[PDB]
From a paper:
One of the best described Siglecs is CD22 (Siglec-2), whose expression is restricted to B cells. CD22 plays a critical role in establishing a baseline level of B-cell inhibition, and thus is a critical determinant of homeostasis in humoral immunity. CD22 is a single-spanning membrane glycoprotein of 140 kDa on the surface of B cells. The extracellular domain (ECD) of CD22 is comprised of seven immunoglobulin (Ig) domains (d1–d7) and 12 putative N-linked glycosylation sites.
To delineate the epratuzumab epitope at high resolution, a glutamine-resurfaced CD2220–330,4Q construct was designed, complexed with epratuzumab Fab, and resulting crystals diffracted to 3.1 Å resolution. CD22 d1–d3/epratuzumab Fab crystals were obtained at a relatively low pH (4.6) and we confirmed by biolayer interferometry (BLI) that epratuzumab is capable of binding to CD22 with high affinity in a range of slightly acidic pHs. The epratuzumab epitope consists of 1308 Å2 of buried surface area and extends beyond only CD22 d3, as previously reported. All three epratuzumab heavy-chain complementarity determining regions (HCDRs), the light-chain CDR1 (LCDR1) and LCDR3 interact with CD22 d2, while HCDR2, LCDR1, and LCDR3 mediate contacts with d3. Perhaps not surprisingly, the epratuzumab paratope includes an N-linked glycan at position N231, for which clear electron density is observed for the first two GlcNAc residues. The CD22 N231Q mutant (a knockout of this glycosylation site) resulted in a 25-fold increase in binding on-rate, and an overall six-fold improvement in binding affinity compared to WT CD22. Together, our data indicate that glycosylation on CD22 impacts the ability of epratuzumab to access its epitope. Location of the epratuzumab epitope at the d2/d3 interface on a tilted CD22 might ideally promote crosslinking by the IgG, consequently causing accentuated B-cell inhibition and apoptosis as a unique mechanism of action for B-cell depletion through CD2244.
Residue numbers in the entry:
A (entry chain Q): 22 to 47, 53 to 329
B (entry chain L): 1 to 27, 27A, 27B, 27C, 27D, 27E, 27F, 28 to 94, ...
C (entry chain H): 1 to 52, 52A, 53 to 82, 82A, 82B, 82C, 83 to 99, 101 to 113, ...
């Protein structure tokens, strides 16, 4: 009709912090209520009054808890410093111009404790492919600066994080994006995003246990590693997997680039060997990602 | 496919003794980032979940007694109980948790005492049980140490396999012995098809295998 | 306060399937992997698999790919583990567990027992003492009952020296069987009557049995 307002639908904060509420609209007096209730019986709005623009001599803003930072023509942004649990509920902006009156409601949800952030990761992380892990917190207020810190197994992750802050009519948040090149060994590790205040102090955090796809990593062993193998002797080689994500399907053995016929187990036994068995040996274990191979063992037969 | 080999499978030691048990991994569990070994030690009591003792191979968890300590790095680890207490009788497991989870075979801890040969008793089936259509013969092995024993049933000198079950008690809290009950079950016709029913007991405390027939 | 709560004991017929639940409390369910661990009777802890409750990605032990299926429900903060074609070797304790950075959290465990049996009371048969040097052994054979909780006492609890009730065994018929024996002085044979008191509450079976020497 005669009023248009724009602001986030819900604003989030916690006890002891501040809330900064962007607001635009399109005035004789402004009054901020908490949970305004119209009484039809007395024809008035009842409830606690958080701000009155009419009280003359009203002290400068930062000497008040509830501060109206707006104008007479476009701006209705608000500031609560400090914000309290009892402020949780509905903020009623009662505006009066010369003919019409309006009550605009903005939701302020105050938690007793700092709420946690939320990590957004790609559905597909694989080794040596760069991905941006994202940490999102739905809070920002100029009077209460904060920071987001990435941890790896409780240890301040070494990479650089990038922090950005949005305080608009559409959304209010602080976001951190950290780029890093995951390896096979991040799979199964715990990544944490800690929300802190200025000092390195804990407020809340979000946590993930990384799922990193990788081709199989292999460790090859040989029995006569320390010693001599002449003709006839026995030699045992084993193929160990360190990790594989997803699970492996088969195992194979290769000698000087050619795959050994009917040698698809994790143990290679050469018994009654000849000098022709000399050469370079490896194993191959296959993933749904692809195959991995271990190091080569060069068996030299002595005679 | 990361296997963990724990040794020994069972320890017997005195009250007040210092006890160690080893866990060797076929591959390294040392993580490259935080230079931590992703191996843990558990204590498990019967019917209960394992209780964590050591994490990252060397850190004792909260409220765990100081007699328990974990050491080692890479592929070799040792759990040490500085002064064995009666409440520490349990089975202990090692556990690697880098990506997936694998566990050691376990180390059963018991109290060591003087070797005691078992008293061997045999019970023939009752006439009451024969009226039901089944015959169970019970071999009883009472108060022996160590726990390792072998019970072989023989029916007309024919060794039995797959028709018997045994059960072993916990180490008794007063004489630190074990007891074993073995039940051989045959149909009535098969029972009446033979004459001599015996259990042969082989045990460290017996110079020769004992047979009750 | 951070605790894993598993479902109750399960008795399934062979060939059937079973689905065990694991409810998570006091933490963000999607933040940590949820594992399942098996412990067969008399054996050690064997890893089954895990699920990432955030993207439902699962990995398994090689030996359980044909057996276990781990799923999760974030709306109920509950993870599940389903076993497919049940055989005798599936009778075991099953734990759900998760790791934090500094510690582990384990569920209380759930028993899966595979048998075709129904609540049945036991038969109590005497283990008669005979001549076959001052000590003799007698007892009671508590046979063919289901499920397991039976209690055996001697002389209404007035006889506790020489007594050993053995752990029950699960026979191939799916019924349990248990032996409870007493070591007594051989001169008491014939005198000071011995009576075993057998109680199986699931079937409301109470059997007193005098063990007389032949
Ligand atoms: C209704 O009317 C009120 C009137 O106050 C408007 O309020 C202004 O809001 C803006 C942002 O919305 C405020 O701007 C902020 O100022 C802070 C201080 O500025 C400088 O501070 C020191 C120097 O004193 C420098 O070191 C610093 O770098 C700043 O240059 C800053 O903390 C803010 O910077 C952050 O945000 C902006 C954009 O959000 C980025 O450009 C910055 O790089 C940084 O990320 C920001 O500059 C301003 O202070 C408020 N007014 C007053 C008088 O203080 C409302 O915006 C208006 N409502 C609407 C809907 O328009
Ligand atoms: C992340 O948040 C959790 C939860 O608040 C923190 O865990 C708490 O840690 C303190 C001391 O470190 C303990 O007193 C609490 O009991 C813990 N609570 C829970 C639910 O575990 C954790 O420390 C934070 N940081 C990291 C790196 O995980």
């Amino acid at each position: 009709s005669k009023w248009v307002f724009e602001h986030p639908e819900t604003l989030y904060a916690w006890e002891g912090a501040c809330v900064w509420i962007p607001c635009t609209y399109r005035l004789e007096s402004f009054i901020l209520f908490h949970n305004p209730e119209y009484n039809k019986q007395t024809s008035k709005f009842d409830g606690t009054r958080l701000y009155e623009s009419t009280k003359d001599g009203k002290v400068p803003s930062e000497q008040k808890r509830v501060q109206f930072l707006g104008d007479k023509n476009k701006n209705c942004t608000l500031s609560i410093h400090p914000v309290h649990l009892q402020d949780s509920g509905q903020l009623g902006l009662r505006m009066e111009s010369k003919t019409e009156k309006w009550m605009e409601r903005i939701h302020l949800q105050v938690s007793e404790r700092p709420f946690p952030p939320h990590i957004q990761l790609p559905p597909e992380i694989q080794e040596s492919q760069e991905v941006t892990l994202t940490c999102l917190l739905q809070f920002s207020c100029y009077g209460y600066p904060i920071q987001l810190q990435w941890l790896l197994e409780g240890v301040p992750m070494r990479q650089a994080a990038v922090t950005s802050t949005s305080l608009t009519i559409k959304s209010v948040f602080t976001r951190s994006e950290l780029k890093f090149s995951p390896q096979w060994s991040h799979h199964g590790k715990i990544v944490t995003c800690q929300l802190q205040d200025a000092d390195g102090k804990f407020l809340s955090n979000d946590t993930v246990q990384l799922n990193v796809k990788h081709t199989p990593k292999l460790e090859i062993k040989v029995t006569p590693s320390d010693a001599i193998v002449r003709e006839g002797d026995s030699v045992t080689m084993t193929c160990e997997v360190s990790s594989s994500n997803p699970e492996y399907t088969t195992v194979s053995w290769l000698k000087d680039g050619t795959s050994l016929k009917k040698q698809n187990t994790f143990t290679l036994n050469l018994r009654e060997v000849t000098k022709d068995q000399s050469g370079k040996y490896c194993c191959q274990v296959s993933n749904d990602v692809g195959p991995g191979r271990s190091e080569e063992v060069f068996l030299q037969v002595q005679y | 496919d990361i296997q963990l080999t724990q040794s020994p499978s069972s320890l017997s030691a005195s009250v007040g003794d210092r006890v160690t048990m080893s866990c060797k991994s076929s591959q390294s569990v040392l993580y490259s980032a935080n230079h931590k070994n992703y191996l843990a030690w558990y204590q498990q009591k019967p019917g209960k979940a394992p209780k964590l003792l050591i994490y990252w191979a060397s850190t004792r968890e909260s409220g765990v007694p100081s007699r328990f300590s974990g050491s080692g790095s890479g592929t070799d680890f040792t759990l040490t109980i500085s002064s064995l207490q009666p409440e520490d009788i349990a089975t202990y497991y090692c556990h690697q948790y880098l990506s997936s989870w694998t566990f050691g075979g376990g180390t059963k801890l018991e109290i060591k005492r003087t070797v005691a040969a078992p008293s061997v008793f045999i019970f023939p089936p009752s006439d009451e049980q024969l009226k039901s259509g089944t015959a169970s013969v019970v071999c009883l092995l009472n108060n022996f140490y160590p726990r390792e024993a072998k019970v072989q049933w023989k029916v007309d000198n024919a060794l039995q396999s797959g028709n018997s079950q045994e059960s072993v008690t916990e180490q008794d809290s007063k004489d630190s012995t074990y007891s074993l009950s073995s039940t051989l079950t045959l149909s009535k016709a098969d029972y009446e098809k033979h004459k001599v029913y015996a259990c042969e007991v082989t045990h460290q405390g017996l110079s020769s295998p004992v047979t009750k027939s | 306060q951070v605790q894993l709560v598993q479902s109750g004991a399960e008795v399934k017929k062979p060939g059937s399937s079973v689905k065990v639940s694991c409810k998570a409390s006091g933490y963000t369910f999607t933040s940590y992997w949820l594992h399942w661990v098996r412990q067969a009777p008399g054996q050690g802890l064997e890893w089954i698999g895990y699920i990432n409750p955030r993207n439902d990605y699962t990995e398994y032990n090689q030996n359980f790919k044909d057996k276990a299926t781990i799923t999760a429900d974030e709306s109920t903060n509950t993870a599940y583990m389903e076993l497919s074609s049940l055989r005798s070797e599936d009778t075991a304790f099953y734990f759900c567990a998760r790791r934090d950075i500094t510690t582990f959290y384990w569920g209380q465990g759930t028993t899966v027992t595979v048998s075709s049996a129904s609540t049945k009371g036991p038969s109590v048969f005497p283990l008669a003492p005979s001549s076959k040097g001052g000590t003799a052994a007698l007892g009671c054979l508590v046979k063919d009952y289901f499920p397991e909780p039976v209690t055996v006492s001697w002389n209404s609890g007035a006889l506790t020296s020489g007594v050993h009730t053995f752990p029950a065994v699960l026979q191939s018929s799916g019924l349990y069987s248990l032996s409870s024996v007493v070591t007594v002085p051989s001169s008491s044979l014939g005198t000071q009557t011995y009576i075993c008191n057998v109680n199986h509450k699931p079937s409301n079976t109470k059997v007193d049995k005098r063990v007389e020497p032949k």
